[PDB]
Design a protein around this ligand. Structure first.
Ligand SMILES: *[Se]c1ccccc1C(=O)Nc1ccccc1
Length: 184
């Protein structure tokens, strides 16, 4: 059994494309650390993301700075998960408590031990897997990461739990509407 929302998404977008240009002529790449998989699910189906106030200021600056001379890529990982779950392109400046359009491109789990050997000189040579939200990846290291994520033969992705997230969100909504109703 597959969910019809996921089927509409799969038919309308080309997730995990076989021909992806990882050796960029230009562009900038950033690590997004999400608090939960729920946020990732919502982001994939609505093509939207928000960081913190400072995160949105930095991503705003990067997007407007690039002036469509190249892409701005976001590599997503949930705090404490041990893998990246996909990559999306930032597609609009931040709109104002600050949201912005994103286009998901890769939706696949890449374990951290596939990427931990890549270290970030602008972050005390710490592994790319030990980054904070909106940490920028140097371009050549970005190409190493994009190549690895693009070519990895993933065995799973958040899509495998799609219906589960669908149900969670729905229950949460009712739980809120009832609780709020009980207050007034
Ligand atoms: Se973020 C945000 C800010 C203002 C209005 C709406 C949103 C939104 O839809 N956010 C969201 C989508 C997916 C995952 C996390 C947050």
């Amino acid at each position: 059994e597959s969910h019809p929302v996921l089927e509409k998404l799969k038919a309308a977008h080309s997730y995990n494309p076989k021909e992806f240009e990882w050796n960029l002529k230009s562009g900038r790449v950033f690590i997004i650390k999400s608090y939960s998989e729920d946020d990732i699910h919502r982001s994939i189906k609505y093509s939207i993301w928000c960081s913190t106030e400072h995160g949105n200021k930095r991503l705003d600056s990067a997007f407007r700075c690039m002036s469509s001379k190249g892409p701005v890529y976001l590599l997503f990982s949930v705090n404490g998960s041990g893998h990246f779950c996909g990559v999306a392109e930032m597609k609009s400046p931040v709109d104002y408590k600050g949201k912005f359009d994103v286009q998901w491109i890769f939706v696949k789990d890449v374990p951290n031990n596939q990427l931990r050997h890549i270290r970030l000189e602008n972050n005390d040579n710490k592994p790319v897997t030990n980054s904070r939200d909106t940490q920028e990846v140097p371009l050549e290291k970005a190409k190493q990461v994009l190549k690895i994520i693009s070519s990895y033969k993933h065995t799973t992705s958040i899509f495998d739990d799609f219906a589960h997230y669908e149900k969670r969100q729905a229950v949460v909504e009712v739980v809120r509407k009832e609780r709020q109703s009980r207050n007034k």
